[PDB]
Scaffold this active site. Sequence first.
Site, PDB file in Angstrom:
ATOM      1  N   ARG A  70       0.885  -1.162   0.000  1.00 28.20           N
ATOM      2  CA  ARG A  70       0.000   0.000   0.000  1.00 28.20           C
ATOM      3  C   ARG A  70       0.923   1.212   0.000  1.00 28.20           C
ATOM      4  NH1 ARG A  70      -2.912   2.683   4.957  1.00 28.20           N
ATOM      5  NH2 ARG A  70      -4.510   4.045   3.952  1.00 28.20           N
ATOM      6  N   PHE A 110       2.050  10.665   1.712  1.00 27.92           N
ATOM      7  CA  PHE A 110       1.498  10.201   2.954  1.00 27.92           C
ATOM      8  C   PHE A 110       2.416   9.148   3.581  1.00 27.92           C
ATOM      9  CE2 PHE A 110      -2.093   7.422   4.876  1.00 27.92           C
ATOM     10  CZ  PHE A 110      -1.788   7.894   6.140  1.00 27.92           C
ATOM     11  N   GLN A 163       3.603   1.300   3.206  1.00 22.50           N
ATOM     12  CA  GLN A 163       3.206   0.284   4.210  1.00 22.50           C
ATOM     13  C   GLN A 163       3.537  -1.125   3.687  1.00 22.50           C
ATOM     14  OE1 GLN A 163      -0.935   0.633   5.458  1.00 22.50           O
ATOM     15  NE2 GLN A 163      -1.012  -1.511   6.114  1.00 22.50           N
ATOM     16  N   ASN A 169      -2.267  -0.949  12.067  1.00 20.89           N
ATOM     17  CA  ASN A 169      -3.117  -1.712  12.947  1.00 20.89           C
ATOM     18  C   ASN A 169      -4.520  -1.564  12.421  1.00 20.89           C
ATOM     19  OD1 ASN A 169      -4.523   0.584  14.052  1.00 20.89           O
ATOM     20  ND2 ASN A 169      -2.691   1.074  15.351  1.00 20.89           N
ATOM     21  N   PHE A 173       4.442   1.077   8.685  1.00 19.60           N
ATOM     22  CA  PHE A 173       4.573   2.052   7.587  1.00 19.60           C
ATOM     23  C   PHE A 173       5.701   3.005   7.863  1.00 19.60           C
ATOM     24  CE2 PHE A 173       1.507   3.653  10.704  1.00 19.60           C
ATOM     25  CZ  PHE A 173       1.719   5.010  10.805  1.00 19.60           C
ATOM     26  N   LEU A 199      -2.017  10.738  13.173  1.00 17.99           N
ATOM     27  CA  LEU A 199      -1.791   9.340  13.543  1.00 17.99           C
ATOM     28  C   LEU A 199      -1.275   9.206  14.997  1.00 17.99           C
ATOM     29  CD1 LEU A 199      -0.145   7.993  10.200  1.00 17.99           C
ATOM     30  CD2 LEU A 199      -2.623   8.133  10.849  1.00 17.99           C
ATOM     31  N   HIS A 247      -1.263   5.090  16.362  1.00 21.02           N
ATOM     32  CA  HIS A 247      -0.276   4.145  15.879  1.00 21.02           C
ATOM     33  C   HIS A 247       0.983   4.287  16.708  1.00 21.02           C
ATOM     34  CE1 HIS A 247      -2.742   3.217  12.353  1.00 21.02           C
ATOM     35  NE2 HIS A 247      -3.186   4.438  12.569  1.00 21.02           N
TER      36      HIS A 247
END
Length: 174
Positions: A62, A67, A70, A109, A120, A129, A133
Amino acid sequence: TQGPGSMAASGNVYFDVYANEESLGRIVMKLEDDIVPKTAKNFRTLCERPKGEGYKGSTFHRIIPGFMVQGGDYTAHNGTGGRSIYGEKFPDENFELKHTKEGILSMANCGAHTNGSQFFITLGKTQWLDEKHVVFGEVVEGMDVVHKIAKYGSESGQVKKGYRIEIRDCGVLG
């Protein structure tokens, strides 16, 4: 005076990243063992284990330009899998470290206390985040290799048709 030097950096881990058979280069990560020992241990161990039992031969599945990138889903290769070294989902150890900049290494997660093996690396500050995370490390060499990975993604996260972005080898320095 020429010649190789001995290792300074122990505990640091690396990924040799490939786009199909083309080398993108090496990413080296420092882990915050003193702050998040079990989270650091999980990730380091998954770097040292053989193919099929850790990150070796797994993918960045991903990839979202601007951004983050991952990976860590070494069982299903799609975001639905992965397994921590503890055998299942483990708690958020703490949220002492924050997503302050590009090159932060953090756990993916699917909600509170669902850490497995997916992680990531951020492409910028991602303050939204924080407290969601667990941050456990950072990129200390090869941040430019993270930006190369991002070239093979999209808004949706889908990876460029015809490409597998692979962690071909990985381990601990030392």
